[PDB]
């Protein structure tokens, strides 16, 4: 497997087989154990990595940096300003220049087309740290986390529901991943925000080969029944207009993950997941503005759920690093 | 070493969180690490550690000190600047703390209310170091006391007399007063009464000082405040984050507390040394300093160029010592 | 030259002799070989470098970072905001503080006077990563690249033309460098944008000693006749007001490097160079806005040229790193 991943880009899970994805998750677990044991071998010694961010990030950027450092690599962070990218230099040119100096490149930003163009022109591995359409490294971490908290199930045995805006990058990626791994995923939200028809048809085609199931529904009780995990994300994503809150809060509010939703699973051990950052109280400037305008306290999840014993969001966040490390080691390591 | 043991895994949020002997230990360790770097004998005690540096205010010395100290000790760093991350607009400090705590071995924070750094320190689960808040600037004062010891030819801190002039209730004034009380020093806070430190903080420091033999004097009178001082210290009259409307109201109030050569002469001490945490407004070579001094027809604000560039000024030794003392804090808490 | 380069600042090519510049070029080639062979020895192990940027950068910043990393050094990037520089703290004070903590300092920004002040006060080597007036590290990379693509010619044997805005940092530095190395350079552009007369005079004096030739001309046909390389750069530089485009497109467009200009060289082996970033199509926001407004496809260079077999811009861009490495190794190693 390892050999088959060296020099690969990591642009989207549609580009990877079931067994490649399982391999990456297994490698993540091995690297995690090694870091905890003090026995990590540095497979990226002497390698230099460029991290391009055109959107804000805490987890993803930090995960890249720490993963690189632990593995012996050095990093250059190219933030939303300070470089020539976009205003003064094309992505084809930036890809070719960075490919001359760096051993691998991460990109977070806007359209998937941009990352694909980087991936085609750079000549070194390119990794997608989030695009408007997909967020592949997040789902690797999510699946590692589900396996850790399931105590001996395979992925193909796990049932989970994603609530809210199912057509954002995280919803898209969860559906693709669930299909690839034979899981039972429910997307529970307003029909206007279900994923793109062609993406759903592609994933259903995949799911019929892997034994996976994909349910779209507006009905919370039906969607969440028997779930091991409940997942949600912000209702308006980076780059979108705040006028979207006016269009969406009324449609999404029934899909807020609150204690009643956990109770509707019927599963006393239900675990709550969120990719983060989350709006669960008034301790952010945006969350407070939205909550005040619409008369809410927490948006996609309440404080009571987010801070409960059912919440595994910080384990999930940690696993961003271990899984990003696995991607870099598989694609760039010795 | 008992001090070393009790310091492992601690935050460094404020000097009020450390004993007199712990603070002495950190100063002593700083001197050892300084000697080691100069001799080429420094051992890397932070090999494989990763540190996150959160900055919500600008910085040259503190940022650079944390980076170089980490680098020298074998650690790697992530700088998380005023924007580019999810902090504050999209993610709470409690959440940020817990996430960073999962990935990094230690975290620096520079920013606004002390309450924020305290929250980060409670929630992170790894050492959190305060690189400046509105209320306190603890790493600065470690550097200052190492510098005073290096320039005092064998005197202990408990033997040193010093005055801080100007805005005595800013972070550095607050911290100098706590540090002086801890270490048994004689400190005079010299400034307008409205800018004296909070009465509750003064009372806490007077209690600390009674057991160490320290002395705390608050006065508006410069000549009585500086008599006999080994060191004179000042800082800008308007601090980061305060409204810049304050310059109009404060320059004329604070101008009597400018450190100039007459003030040095009022000490009556030919060996007097001048200290400033930096950055300093001492001429027309900054945009802000030039605009505010020109408004009053002044050449320099809190300190003159004549004092700042004199043989009495030890500000660049003090600046260098920011690195060696931040190194001690990180080695003690994570080494 | 080894003894002579240790602890030096690298503020402008005017400060270096012909032999020192050739030594840096030769060292860059040796370091490039070592990285490609996997034999690179770390001569900056344990050194810490500060990188101050008051203007944007992709190549220069990345070059300094990768060069340092490869050589065992660590770096602090101090970007256009986040520090106390300028508004709160003087450059004399900044220099002195950074000199206490770091082993070397890079500066990219505005007036050359600022970098000179930093180099006078820091007490450690200071390197100019671009100023309004000069861009010395670029020209090292450019001359390394010419030597690689000239089939055994020496620099003193090479003829080249720079087209467009001759008084920008890159035009200035190419003229200085051409003078130092005995080259035949033509600066080809509108006379309002020819380099300062005092700098031209200084370069002519240098050229008299080295056998170099410096020509200023508005004539493209004559200017490019026989050249081995054609070089251009954007018509409006960082820190200039965007209103400059309206003045300069009409004056500069006859100096666009297009396939007809390459043809006018009479040289089937002519190669095209550009410091980058370049406006050669509509795939940047500034480039698209300006070109669309003026009915053009590409500004200083066309796509047809830039993506042609004659274009060596990515080799040149790579060479930014190997040449910055040499500057650091020579001055701090
Ligand atoms: C990690 C952030 C994911 C969110 N859907 C967004 O794109 O903002
Ligand atoms: C190091 C800066 C200290 C100053 N009192 C401020 O807070 O701006
Ligand atoms: C490397 C950029 C060169 C250009 N003359 C500028 O100053 O913008
Ligand atoms: Cl994906
Ligand atoms: Cl609830
Ligand atoms: Cl304090
Ligand atoms: Cl004076
Ligand atoms: Cl030059
Ligand atoms: Cl053409």
Describe the model.
The structure is a homotrimer. The two termini of chain A are 14 Å apart. The first copy, chain A, has a five-stranded parallel beta sheet. Chain A is 46% helix and 13% strand. With 334 residues, the first copy, chain A, is α/β, with parallel strands linked by helices. Chain A is built from 14 helices and nine strands. The first copy, chain A, has two domains: 1-137 and 320-333, Rossmann fold (3-Layer(aba) Sandwich); 138-319, Rossmann fold (3-Layer(aba) Sandwich). In chain A, helix 6 crosses helix 14 (313-332). Chains in contact: A-B, A-C, B-C. The complex binds norvaline (3 copies) and chloride ion (6 copies). One chloride ion is lined by residues 12-13, 134, 136, 173, 176 of chain A. Chain B: L-ornithine binds at residues 171, 235, 239-240. Chain B: Its main location: cytoplasm. Chain B: It is an enzyme of class 2 (transferase). Chain B: Carbamoyl phosphate binds at residues 59-62, 86, 110, 137-140, 277-278, 322. Chain B: Its EC number is 2.1.3.3.
């Amino acid at each position: 497997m390892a050999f088959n991943l060296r020099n690969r880009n990591f642009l989207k899970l549609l580009d990877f087989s079931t067994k490649e994805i399982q391999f990456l998750i297994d490698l993540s677990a091995d690297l995690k154990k090694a870091k905890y044991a003090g026995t990590e071998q540095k497979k990226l010694l002497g390698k230099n990595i460029a991290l391009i961010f055109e959107k804000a990030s805490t987890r993803t950027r930090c995960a890249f940096e720490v993963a690189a450092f632990d593995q012996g690599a050095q990093v250059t962070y190219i933030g939303p300003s300070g470089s020539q990218i976009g205003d003064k230099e094309s992505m084809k040119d930036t890809a070719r220049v960075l490919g001359r100096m760096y051993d691998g490149i991460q990109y977070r930003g806007f359209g998937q087309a941009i990352v694909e163009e980087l991936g085609a022109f750079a000549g070194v591995p390119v990794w997608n740290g989030l695009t408007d359409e997909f967020h592949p490294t997040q789902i690797l971490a999510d699946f590692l986390t589900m396996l850790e908290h399931s105590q001996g199930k395979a992925l193909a045995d796990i049932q989970f529901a994603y609530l809210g805006d199912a057509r954002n990058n995280v919803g898209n990626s969860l559906m693709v991943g669930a299909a690839k791994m034979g899981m039972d995923i429910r997307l529970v939200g307003p029909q206007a925000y279900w994923p793109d028809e062609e993406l759903v048809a592609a994933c259903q085609a995949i799911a019929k080969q892997t034994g996976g199931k994909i349910t779209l529904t507006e009905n919370v009780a039906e969607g969440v029944q028997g779930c091991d995990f409940l997942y949600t994300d912000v209702w308006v994503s980076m780059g979108e207009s705040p006028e979207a809150w006016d269009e969406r809060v009324a449609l999404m509010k029934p899909y807020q993950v609150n204690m009643n939703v956990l109770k509707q699973t019927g599963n006393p051990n239900v675990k709550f997941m969120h990719c983060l950052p989350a709006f669960h109280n008034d301790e952010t400037t945006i969350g407070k503005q939205v909550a005040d305008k619409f008369g809410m306290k927490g948006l996609e999840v309440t404080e009571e759920v987010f801070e409960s014993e059912h919440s595994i969001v910080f384990d999930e966040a940690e696993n961003r690093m271990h899984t990003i490390k696995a991607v870099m080691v598989a694609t760039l390591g010795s």
